[PDB]
């Protein structure tokens, strides 16, 4: 009943904060979450730092822990991010579940076919997929837009990219070979860097997870950045569990239970809705 659970920071679903030096206890709506930090780069020596976590998914974990009746030891992944298969080996949150270092992974984890082959996913609890962010007024149909499909067919080519190594890049790689090969030049280290490139005119479009992009558009200063239309390859975030896990059954019923009772809408207005 005491489970090792892995997560990853990505506002507003999971937000990390430093713990109080004088108390060493998490307060408010936060829960304890540790992170393994290296001492140097010449050794494997490291130490777990005690931090605090909050957000949409943390509230979901709290609800689940209570209703499903289990306790946990939440930790932040340090070997990769959400999950990528490299040389046939999974890293990130997915990897932590696959190699059994965690009973489940909770966070902004996108459910897709290749991941579902190595881990079990609960029903989706947050609707997402692939969206496109651009400055208001930009004319683009969606992913299938020729500006994306055949970039060099336009004088100044359209400049667009994603944050590599996630479900979004994996999808583009499999569906649009030319677009993907062209995009790498515009890879963004993260969402924050991407938004800055957009606002300053260094990028024309940013392709990424729909739920995060809608959240970002909802709080954009001046409401200049918006999502086009639309969601391609609709899916959702899901809790990843070990294949054949005994926890899946109760977890699914509880999540569906929350949706029907409106608990998901409350969390939605509490963490996701913005001024724009």
């Amino acid at each position: 009943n005491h489970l090792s659970i892995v997560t990853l920071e990505e506002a507003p679903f999971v937000i990390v904060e430093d713990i109080d030096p004088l108390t060493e206890t998490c307060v408010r709506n936060t829960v304890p979450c540790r992170k393994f930090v290296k001492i140097n780069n010449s050794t494997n020596e490291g130490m777990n730092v005690k931090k605090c976590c909050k957000g949409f998914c943390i509230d979901i974990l709290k609800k689940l822990s209570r209703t499903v009746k289990f306790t946990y030891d939440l930790y932040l992944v340090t070997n990769g991010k959400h999950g990528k298969k490299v040389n046939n080996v999974w890293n990130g949150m997915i990897g932590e579940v696959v190699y059994q270092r965690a009973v489940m992974a909770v966070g902004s984890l996108t459910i897709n076919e290749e991941r579902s082959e190595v881990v079990d996913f609960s029903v989706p609890f947050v609707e997402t997929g692939i969206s496109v962010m651009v400055s208001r007024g930009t004319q683009v149909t969606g992913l299938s837009d020729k500006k994306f499909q055949r970039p060099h067919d336009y004088s100044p080519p359209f400049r667009f990219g994603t944050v590599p190594n996630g479900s979004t890049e994996r999808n583009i790689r499999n569906n649009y070979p030319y677009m993907h090969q062209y995009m790498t030049r515009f890879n963004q280290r993260g969402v924050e860097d991407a938004l800055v490139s957009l606002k300053t005119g260094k990028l024309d479009a940013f392709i990424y997870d729909a739920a995060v992009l809608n959240y970002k558009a909802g709080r954009d200063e001046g409401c200049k950045l918006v999502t086009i239309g639309y969601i391609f390859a609709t899916t959702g975030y899901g809790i990843a569990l070990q294949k054949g896990s005994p926890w899946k059954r109760q977890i699914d019923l509880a999540l569906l239970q929350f949706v029907g009772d409106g608990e998901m809408e409350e969390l939605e207005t509490l963490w996701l809705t913005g001024i724009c």
Binding site: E113, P124, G129, N175, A233, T234, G236, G262
Partner: protein, 271 residues
């Protein structure tokens, strides 16, 4: 060895038409010339009929993908399925799946807690929710409008009997007032309620947005009342010990990811 598929009439996911004199389905094509795939589906009026649409194209894809043969029939009592006290029992497609009359449910079947306790749902093949259908001109705010929260015989509203919507309003104690009002007006099928709205016999129909949005796009005398609530999805239904459940879900995921699901949407909905 041939899978028994049960479905239900519900445009644009499942259209149902009579076969031709010779017992076959009339050859039809989309606006631009693609062949409309049809399957012979038996059902009550028991006689052979023609079935096609979003869900039928999905079945054909799943069957070819997982390499299985099937036979399709329309649910005998014409309902989606709810659990009623008699001991409790399931009716509609839920009952047929649980009794062995069907091996798989392929329709716009809402995934919910109540049903998930007894059967296995695939990952959603369609994400949507509930909205309200009214006659153009009817002024309603949403599920929070006073005409709904503080009912009277002056403004009648309802949903479909033995449906996921019925389960939803009967489950939420805060919707008790609406539930009691609807219990006296619910229709046997979505088609009938929709027709009642056009004939001013029903003032508001609470149903799936995927269906109502489509109806509003085909009949300009009908419109949807803003604000989607009870966001939910449709999934394939199977018994918990079905050996096809893992591959069925993997196939749904694959279809969303490679654009197949979007093609069905362009073909049957967004048109």
């Amino acid at each position: 060895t041939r899978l028994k598929i049960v479905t239900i009439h519900q445009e644009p996911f499942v259209y149902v038409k009579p076969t031709m004199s010779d017992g076959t389905c009339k050859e039809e094509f989309t606006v631009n010339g693609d062949p409309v795939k049809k399957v012979i589906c038996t059902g009550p009026n028991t006689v052979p009929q023609c079935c096609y649409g979003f869900c039928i194209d999905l079945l054909i894809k799943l069957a070819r993908t997982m390499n299985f043969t099937y036979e399709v029939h329309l649910v005998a009592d014409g309902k989606f399925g709810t659990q009623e006290r008699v001991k409790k029992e399931w009716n509609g497609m839920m009952g047929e799946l649980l009794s062995g009359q069907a091996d798989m449910i392929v329709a716009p079947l809402t995934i919910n807690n109540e049903r998930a306790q007894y059967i296995e749902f695939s990952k959603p093949f369609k994400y949507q929710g509930l909205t309200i259908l009214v006659k153009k001109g009817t002024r309603i705010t949403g599920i929070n409008d006073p005409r709904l929260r503080n009912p009277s015989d002056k403004f009648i509203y309802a949903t479909v009997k033995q449906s996921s919507v019925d389960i939803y309003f009967r489950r939420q104690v805060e919707l008790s007032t609406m539930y009691r009002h609807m219990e006296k007006h619910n229709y046997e099928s979505a088609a009938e309620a929709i027709q009642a709205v056009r004939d001013n016999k029903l003032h508001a129909f609470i149903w799936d947005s995927a269906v109502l949005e489509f109806e509003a796009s085909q009949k300009c005398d009908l419109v949807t009342t803003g604000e989607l609530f009870f966001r939910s999805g449709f999934g394939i239904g199977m018994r918990k010990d079905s050996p096809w459940k893992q591959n069925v879900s993997l196939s749904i995921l694959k279809s969303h990811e490679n654009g197949f699901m979007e093609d069905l949407d362009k073909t049957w909905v967004r048109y």
